[PDB]
């Protein structure tokens, strides 16, 4: 047994990560608890398209590198998040469509991945490409309107840019095996594997709440994606109300699936959360451990 989340995960070769925000890196409580507890970091915003390429062709890695360097100085690996996405696009990219957008998408992938080549264990190459609801359709965006192949092109680009990185597709509302969105993502990954599209991993954001609740069948989802020949990762876990039982359940689903790489929670203290009103994380506002912390640690320790 181990006394911290990352170390406990590492006993089985897994990680326990968090999202890190550069604007919080002057908060001594934040940096010390995050430093102690996690062995994997995702930048909460700093590696997104707008942050890294604020004008076309003009990269700015200052905030991204602050997060990256904090991670490596503190003994963590890094998940890169995210290269191609409808959200948080800079204005210049929102104005592009079709072939011009395709070139810009490719250029963005190449430039960001080159900056971090060999340094990033997993990239969320593509984020949130499916619609919610019963259709299983692709989400509408400039990217999708450029062609159904946008996603595969992004992956092929990423494979060439950094052959050392695990290339992940990341999404939410894809945890429940019975949901249409989950099935759409399953069919995509299966199709990609069958056609030689390079994809190594699927990220389950795992933003569980009353409208999109955890189900025990998450384990079935994880198993079934693993059986396609991809790793699986829980990438942005948070749970409305931070119920200890649900947190243990998710943890045990990862531990039960050999291809589950690890778990990232989407922030440190409840007050750091993008959904702080839902108190959905493992640490209280004052940095103390919640009941859910103990349930996760105990699960990681068997
Ligand atoms: O600061 C928030 C940030 O937490 C949020 O992160 C996204 C949550 N939804 C899924 C995405 O994959 C995450 O990047 O993005 C919006 C920011 O304002």
From Swiss-Prot:
Give the gene name. Answer: xlnA
Query: Which residues carry out catalysis?
Result: 128, 236
Protein name, UniProt field: Endo-1,4-beta-xylanase A
Primary localisation category: secreted
Q: What is the lineage of its organism?
A: Bacteria, Bacillati, Actinomycetota, Actinomycetes, Kitasatosporales
What Gene Ontology terms describe where this protein resides (cellular component)? extracellular region
User: Quick one: which pathway?
Assistant: Glycan degradation; xylan degradation
Q: Which molecular-function annotation in GO is an example for this chain? A: endo-1,4-beta-xylanase activity
Span within the entire protein?
Answer: 42 to 343 of 477
Recorded E.C. number(s)?
A: 3.2.1.8
Query: Looking at the record's lineage, which domain of life comes first?
Result: Bacteria
Query: Which EC class heads this enzyme's classification?
Result: hydrolase
């Amino acid at each position: 047994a181990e006394s911290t989340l990352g170390a406990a995960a590492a006993q089985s070769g897994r990680y326990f990560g968090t999202a890190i925000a550069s604007g919080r890196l002057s908060d001594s409580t934040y940096t010390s608890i995050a430093g102690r507890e996690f062995n994997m970091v995702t930048a909460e915003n700093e590696m997104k398209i707008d942050a890294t390429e604020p004008q076309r062709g003009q990269f700015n890695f200052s905030s991204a590198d602050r997060v990256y360097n904090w991670a490596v100085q503190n003994g963590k690996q890094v998940r890169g998040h995210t290269l191609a996405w409808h959200s948080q696009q800079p204005g210049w990219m929102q104005s592009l469509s079709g072939s011009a957008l395709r070139q810009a998408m490719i250029d963005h992938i190449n430039g960001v991945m080159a900056h971090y080549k060999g340094k990033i264990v997993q990239w969320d190459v593509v984020n949130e490409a499916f619609a919610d609801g019963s259709s299983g359709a692709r989400r509408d965006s400039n990217l999708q309107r450029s062609g159904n192949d946008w996603i595969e092109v992004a992956f092929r680009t990423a494979r060439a840019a950094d052959p050392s990185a695990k290339l992940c597709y990341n999404d939410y509302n894809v945890e429940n095996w019975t949901w249409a969105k989950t099935q759409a993502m399953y069919n995509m990954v299966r199709d990609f594997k069958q056609r030689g599209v390079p994809i190594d991993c699927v990220g389950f954001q795992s933003h569980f709440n009353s409208g999109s609740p955890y189900n025990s069948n998450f384990r079935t989802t994880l198993q079934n994606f693993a059986a396609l020949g991809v790793d699986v990762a829980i990438t942005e876990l948070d749970i409305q109300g931070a119920p200890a039982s649900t947190y243990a359940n998710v943890t045990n689903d990862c531990l039960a699936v050999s291809r589950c790489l690890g778990i990232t929670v989407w922030g440190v203290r409840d007050s750091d959360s993008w959904r702080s009103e839902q108190t959905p994380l493992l640490f209280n506002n004052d940095g103390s451990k919640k009941a859910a912390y103990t349930a996760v640690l105990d699960a990681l320790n068997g």
